Design a protein that fits this description.
3 copies of one chain form a homotrimer.
Chain A (H helix, E strand, L loop, with lengths): L3 E7 L6 E3 L7 E3 L2 E3 L1 E2 L6 E4 L3 E3 L5 H6 L14 E4 L10 E2 L3 H11 L4 E3 L7 E2 L4 E6 L2 E3 L4 E3 L1 E2 L7 E6 L6 E9 L3 H8 L6 E4 L4 E4 L15 E9 L4 E6 L3 E4 L1 E4 L6 E4 L4 E5 L2 E3 L2 E3 L5 E2 L6 E4 L1 E2 L6 E3 L27 E7 L2 E6 L1 H18 L4 E3 L13 H51 L3 E3 L4 E4 L5 H8 L5 H12 L4
Helix pairs in contact in A: 4-5
The complex binds a molecule of 3 linked components (NAG-NAG-MAN) (3 copies), a molecule of 2 linked components (NAG-NAG) (3 copies), N-acetyl-alpha-neuraminic acid (3 copies) and 2-acetamido-2-deoxy-beta-D-glucopyranose (18 copies).
Chain lengths: ~500, ~500, ~500
């Protein structure tokens, strides 16, 4: 009696969460949020990127014009999606440096094709095959022109096509490798010889090679596919005596943000910025462990499957006389993070301190604002999965990606530890600041009891306590009473 | 009266600057410095690196010996500068893997060439062309030897050149692809056949291919360029029946720090360690946003166009009775960063505290010393801009560089935030330390007024105040007076 | 007299060590530990990885079956070690893209070979050479079959081998380039023609090229080596009229963690997880400066040759009346890190504080636990040293590795500075916490003397001092005595 107690404290919750800081591998805090995205819907959203589902067609099949890919003519995409079920159903072919032609067409993002009138005087055009049926008739790749002899003559071709446009032209062409010498004569009326396709700045010479390969869709022959880009002011020149699978025109070649992805995920009617082979994923979080292959505004790939960011202070159980924050949280404090408990003539009371609570909350919201909803866009990259063994180039592609992921995984680990340490520090600091400013108000009218509470040595009723909480307490009013109570022989 | 006031404080400035810390996206400090270099002079300084301006010549034109490049013979460089205006003016040629030959010669850093006496018995040497004029006469690449028939015979060449030196030899040679069968016979007196250039450890076979290409400087033929490196103790062997553009000797191949850069920046008479395509840039700062392409001791390329490093404390306006540092800076404090203000019998005074001021300044200068003027040198790297579409290899080169820049940009962002937080912390700490040590000196002779000031409960004249500032105040001298004043019923 | 002194302090050592923090380039602490591994034993331990020492054989020589490599047949490895002394001693050969075949076999980790019965009707099998002696007889590569004419006929080969297995088959084969037209006829009875090796998904055509190369072990001819991987359900088809160096079967191709390393280090009977070309190195430390080439659970390569992690507090000399921690350490404090010194009626004493000491030690041990003995495994990577000049691909391989090392070296530098700052902070904090809690116990019975000591204003014998140290001091017992002593006119 003749005194009061005023304790400073902070909240605690019954269901806290464990995070990592620089000081502690495990510390329980009142709340945290997940920074690694680990699930996908399992579908690729068809918005807001332009998606082209290849269905049974690879990009290269759609480029050459396999009959089952006729519906793709002239289409564009942000992301071309190639399915594992895709298969070729025309004349058997290969592309030396297939991966590069696939990449450059994918990045260009368009199959726009402009027909041109090549002068094929002296040969038969439009060769077809039972291996490439279009609406039940023998046919061929839509964008290619199989030239054969005319009246058992195949005169030497020396054919030109100038580029008088303001843009580049991509030409796709081929060399036919017949199964037998019989086929060579039947088709071209003479022995095979080289093909040379040239411009002012480039030349490619290819040798047709007669011979049986293992039959594919019953065909032992092959076509090998080549490409040439022709600049404005340059000229395509084609020089051949046979075996030429000629271009019917050129593809536009564009630059932009298009790419290609291998995925079996279904395409859905929905909207998501970040695409992975597993499906679209939300991009609120800064990191993700779903797939290293991404397109769009995506979280960065890391190895961790969880990284928890503290969003509240240390969670400290309440010890079973009122008491302050020293080794003690207040589970009953539910309208603030920090506050006051008092005992005086009028009872025992609690009040939240708004300023300290808001100071902590604002700083935590600040770091969430830097980390949440801030992903950056990436588009065409490098391949990261491989179906064939290749050696040196693939070794480098894999090492580049491994290197990158380990460096990001490190950054993520350090960032979360540093941020969590800072959160513990800033929330501890708001408690300490509140205690110190209360101490300063009280001057010589109170003593520190060592448990986060002051013994106030004068009668201090509810309004008096309120004056301390509100920062309007006038210590001079009570000093005489308090000094007498403090410094009395007992 | 019978008392004095002593306030602890810190300076403030009218023109502060905004920086970023871990706690605050924006906090005003008294001063900061820029860590991202964003401008260039626009010229490449000719010192201290040895610069070779290619003018109208590419490195490869200078290597082969295009007549307009004769002035480059045998020159060395640290940095070869290739101009966008550069053009070839000799026989039209291509180099399979041009980029690699360009790179290896660039990195070697020398065009030193040693003539050798090949045994070309039975052929005519020194073929020339109107397409390659030297001083108005028909000529040819200086370092190459166009062999043609002698008396309508071209006997099979089987020619040797041993390397009996202690160093490697770089041989440059070529294959002529004539426009027509008429030219083939006119030049070599027989049908074309393969060329084989070999050593004990390597072999290259190349097939001349007759045919018209689009005319370049009125020439429908082409030369294709190849290279062979011959080790000490090995032997070059050249085997041909025509179409051989022979070497006249070898290039020295060196190892060191040389490179090549594409730039149109003028070369100036000045001295700068760091070269970019935009010109030389100062290298005081740790980061730069001028160009990802660099040579020499250069700041690291980042995406940010500014990163401000705090070089002073938080800048806090002065509130409109003297008062201390609590929510309050002192704009009138101009000879120190921290200090004392007092009110006593003799007036109101101010003095700077040297120790605390110097402690902060020394620590800030320390971090400037780690960050300023400490760039590291890089020399030949990878190419980072491309004039042609290529696919896989280029995709990887671009991804490697993008990856690197994003990781450095992250490091830069975190470093500056961490350093700035530390600067705010260390400057706040010097203020708090000064307050605490003053508190300790005063013992029971003063009370904390809560605004960064002490109420000293005894007469404390100028010399008394000085004794506190100087750390020589003897509290026992005044304790009796002070205790009487403090603990008095009023 | 009628008073006592109680000082709070921390230990100091005569032999401290210099570390780097964020605040200080150099600060002496009581102890530190090295985080960069800089030495090796100089031997490669034969455990726990399966080591295969190539001795005089390269992997490719062991693959083809050079007689000196017969002992390697069918062996497996985790790490194949190639020696600089290794040399070929059979028919001279080259491998276009040698580096890739070396890499893919190295990564597969097995030389397991299954013989198959090819139908070589109409030719002579098992050609041998004096250039490839096996037990003093003319012989040839064990895994290859040199086919020559039979009765001066070499009928066109068109030979099949289906893959009816559940795994992939690696075929190694070759093309013989004879020195002269005489050898061509002597061996194959007709002019040279192309070789085509194909599957349903691939084709390779190679042209034998007759001509003398510089003699190697007295042989001017060459064999060029090729490879083909055949999938389950696919078929190998070989088509040739001569010059075929045929496969005798296939290699198993596996996937796993195998690699290859160039080293001259001796192999020892010992156990070490981390292998470098310099020898095995311990992997307790997180970083190493021994070699960028590593295999196994290894520290990460950095440029620094030392990084010292503080494992104790700031080391502060003792100043030459007892005194506390303010600018002063206690070299005589050897059974604790923090403690108490007192002066009372019964003498001058010292005692360690266990709690504070253990708190610091536990946190330091925690960070050691994150950093020590926690390396991660890497296996087959990219090559990092090169014996030949190559240009573009090598430039990229080198730049990737340089980039990686600089980023890790940065991470290491920042990590150690941050950790050391945290250690200084946490150890400083334990001292400050101990002082503050002692202050709180003492209430109004003591004053802070400003040197880390309290003047206790009552008789405080050994048991009284112990009660303070033990946290059981009851300030109310002594308050009357203390207040009288404190507030007395003198
Ligand atoms: C070189 O050898 C090849 C493999 O032995 C061979 O290919 C095979 O040819 C046979 C016979 O033409 C094909 O068998 C087909 O036989 C009947 C004929 O009416 C067809 O109706 C069937 O569809 C049946 O498949 C094989 O399919 C074929 N095998 C492979 C792997 O392609 C070549 O013919 C040989 N080349 C030469 C020039 O002789
Ligand atoms: C294959 O076709 C080529 C393109 O049509 C052709 O090249 C062209 O040849 C003509 C005629 O020689 C050149 O025209 C030149 O005509 C007069 C002749 O006196 C010259 O004075 C002029 O300079 C004029 O240019 C073209 O310049 C040339 N076109 C190109 C694109 O190179 C080849 O000649 C043909 N090849 C064969 C073997 O017939
Ligand atoms: C093309 O030129 C080559 C280099 O001059 C040449 O190779 C050289 O051939 C000679 C003679 O055969 C070899 O000399 C050998 O002479 C005696 C003959 O009994 C041997 O016992 C010795 O071992 C001695 O070496 C050279 O070794 C050889 N030089 C090289 C560098 O390989 C070719 O023969 C020529 N090719 C043609 C088709 O003529
Ligand atoms: C490229 O075109 C030229 C010109 O048409 C071809 O040259 C003719 O080839 C025929 C058939 O081999 C010869 O009989 C003529 O004598 C050639 N004409 C001229 C004007 O030289 C040439 O063969 C073609 N080249 C290729 C590789 O197909
Ligand atoms: C490499 O040089 C050898 C030796 O000079 C050439 O071989 C001669 O070639 C001529 C012309 O074709 C033949 O008539 C001779 O019979 C060959 N001589 C010998 C000793 O074999 C060979 O042709 C050259 N090779 C190449 C690819 O040019
Ligand atoms: C691949 O094998 C086929 C079939 O055996 C070869 O074709 C024969 O080649 C001979 C010799 O040149 C000719 O006389 C026959 O007329 C061909 N037979 C048939 C059925 O066409 C062919 O030459 C081989 N190809 C290669 C590149 O070696
Ligand atoms: C362009 C052309 O001639 N196409 C014809 C081919 C080829 O002559 C041979 O297949 C070449 O080997 O033969 C067919 O029987 C076929 O297989 O469909 C009919 C087709 O019209
Ligand atoms: C080495 C040689 O023979 N050079 C001569 C060439 C070539 O014979 C043809 O250009 C080959 O196509 O012809 C010229 O008229 C020329 O164009 O300058 C004269 C020159 O001396
Ligand atoms: C497969 C074969 O025929 N091997 C024979 C070779 C070759 O005929 C020529 O070396 C080819 O140039 O010649 C030998 O004298 C030799 O050099 O060892 C004997 C050997 O049995
Ligand atoms: C925990 O923190 C997150 C992020 O600020 C917030 O959205 C959520 O409401 C909080 N949860 C609780 C139970 O307070
Ligand atoms: C793709 O091919 C499969 C298998 O032939 C067929 O059943 C399916 O209808 C095809 N899909 C499309 C879209 O053409
Ligand atoms: C096609 O090329 C031939 C060359 O043999 C030429 O003579 C003819 O005029 C060209 N045809 C047309 C329609 O221009
Ligand atoms: C995504 O697909 C990859 C590759 O197939 C797989 O490893 C991973 O488990 C998948 N992740 C999720 C969340 O579906
Ligand atoms: C605000 O201050 C006044 C001072 O008279 C005090 O009585 C009142 O209770 C305070 N309000 C609160 C909500 O604490
Ligand atoms: C601000 O800081 C920089 C770096 O220390 C210093 O060079 C400059 O003089 C300072 N400017 C002012 C106005 O104090
Ligand atoms: C480069 O070529 C241009 C265009 O022909 C010419 O005007 C200029 O003088 C040349 N410069 C040099 C240095 O030869
Ligand atoms: C040049 O080579 C021929 C080979 O046909 C040789 O006979 C002659 O001696 C050589 N000439 C000289 C000058 O050594
Ligand atoms: C430097 O040149 C690059 C590439 O042309 C350009 O993007 C950039 O704006 C330039 N920077 C400056 C400061 O001139
Ligand atoms: C230094 O200390 C003495 C103590 O007598 C004091 O009087 C003097 O004013 C002090 N000097 C300064 C510059 O404060
Ligand atoms: C120093 O620290 C290391 C790592 O904790 C420890 O192993 C060693 O015993 C310590 N050395 C001394 C002299 O205390
Ligand atoms: C390797 O070759 C050298 C040199 O001929 C020989 O002395 C040594 O015994 C060989 N070693 C083995 C293991 O065969
Ligand atoms: C080998 O191939 C020939 C083709 O000429 C074939 O006729 C023969 O039956 C085959 N031999 C065996 C043993 O199967
Ligand atoms: C390891 O070997 C490398 C490469 O030869 C050498 O540079 C380095 O000094 C070696 N390090 C040690 C500790 O032996
Ligand atoms: C523990 O506390 C008791 C309190 O009576 C004290 O007397 C004793 O000396 C303390 N023990 C130590 C080791 O300080
Ligand atoms: C094929 O070419 C012929 C010329 O022989 C042309 O009339 C026809 O329209 C072409 N068919 C196409 C492009 O589908
Ligand atoms: C060209 O070669 C001839 C030999 O026919 C020689 O005499 C002359 O000096 C050479 N000219 C050069 C290298 O400029
Ligand atoms: C070589 O082939 C013959 C068939 O001519 C066979 O009998 C013999 O066993 C073979 N020798 C080997 C595989 O060592």
């Amino acid at each position: 009696n003749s005194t009061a107690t005023l304790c400073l404290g902070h909240h605690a919750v019954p269901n806290g969460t464990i995070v990592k800081t620089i000081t502690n591998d495990q510390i329980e805090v009142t709340n945290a949020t997940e920074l690694v995205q680990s699930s996908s819907t399992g579908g690729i959203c068809d918005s807001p990127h332009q998606i082209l589902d290849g269905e049974n067609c690879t990009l290269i099949d759609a480029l050459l014009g396999d009959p089952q890919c006729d519906g793709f003519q002239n289409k564009k995409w942000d992301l071309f999606v190639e399915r594992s079920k895709a298969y070729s159903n025309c004349y058997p072919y290969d592309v030396p440096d297939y991966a590069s032609l696939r990449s450059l067409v994918a990045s260009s993002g368009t199959l726009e094709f402009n027909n041109e009138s090549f002068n094929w005087t002296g040969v038969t055009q439009n060769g077809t095959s039972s291996a490439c049926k279009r609406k039940s008739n023998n046919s061929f790749f839509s964008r290619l022109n199989w030239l054969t002899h005319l009246k058992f003559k195949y005169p030497a071709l020396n054919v030109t096509m100038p580029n008088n446009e303001k843009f580049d032209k991509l030409y796709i062409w081929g060399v036919h490798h017949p199964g037998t010498d019989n086929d060579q004569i039947f088709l071209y009326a003479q022995a095979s010889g080289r093909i040379t396709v040239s411009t002012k700045r480039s030349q490619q010479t290819v040798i047709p090679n007669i011979g049986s390969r293992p039959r594919v869709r019953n065909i032992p022959s092959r076509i090998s596919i080549y490409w040439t880009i022709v600049k404005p002011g340059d000229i395509l020149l084609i020089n051949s005596t046979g075996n030429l699978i000629a271009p019917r025109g050129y593809f536009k070649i564009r630059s932009g943000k298009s790419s290609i992805m291998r995925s079996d995920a279904p395409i859905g009617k929905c909207n998501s910025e970040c695409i992975t082979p597993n499906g679209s994923i939300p991009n609120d979080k800064p990191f993700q462990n779903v797939n290293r292959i991404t397109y769009g505004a995506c979280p960065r790939y890391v190895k961790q499957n969880t990284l928890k960011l503290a969003t509240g202070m240390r969670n400290v159980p309440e010890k079973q006389a009122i008491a302050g924050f020293i080794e003690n949280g207040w589970e009953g404090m539910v309208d603030g993070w920090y506050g006051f408990r008092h005992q005086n003539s009028e009872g025992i009371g609690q009040a939240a301190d708004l300023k300290s609570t808001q100071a902590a909350i604002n700083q935590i919201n600040g770091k969430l604002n830097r980390l949440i909803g801030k992903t950056n866009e990436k588009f065409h990259q490098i391949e990261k999965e491989f179906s064939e063994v290749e050696g040196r180039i693939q070794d480098l592609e894999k090492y580049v990606e491994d290197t990158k992921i380990d460096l990001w995984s490190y950054n993520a680990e350090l960032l979360v530890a540093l941020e969590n340490q800072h959160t513990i520090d800033l929330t501890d600091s708001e408690m300490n600041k509140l205690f110190e400013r209360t101490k300063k108000q009280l001057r010589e009218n109170a003593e520190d009891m060592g448990n986060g509470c002051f013994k106030i040595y004068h009668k201090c009723d509810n309004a008096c306590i309120g004056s301390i909480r509100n920062g309007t307490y006038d210590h001079d009013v009570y000093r005489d009473e308090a000094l007498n109570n403090r410094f009395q022989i007992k």
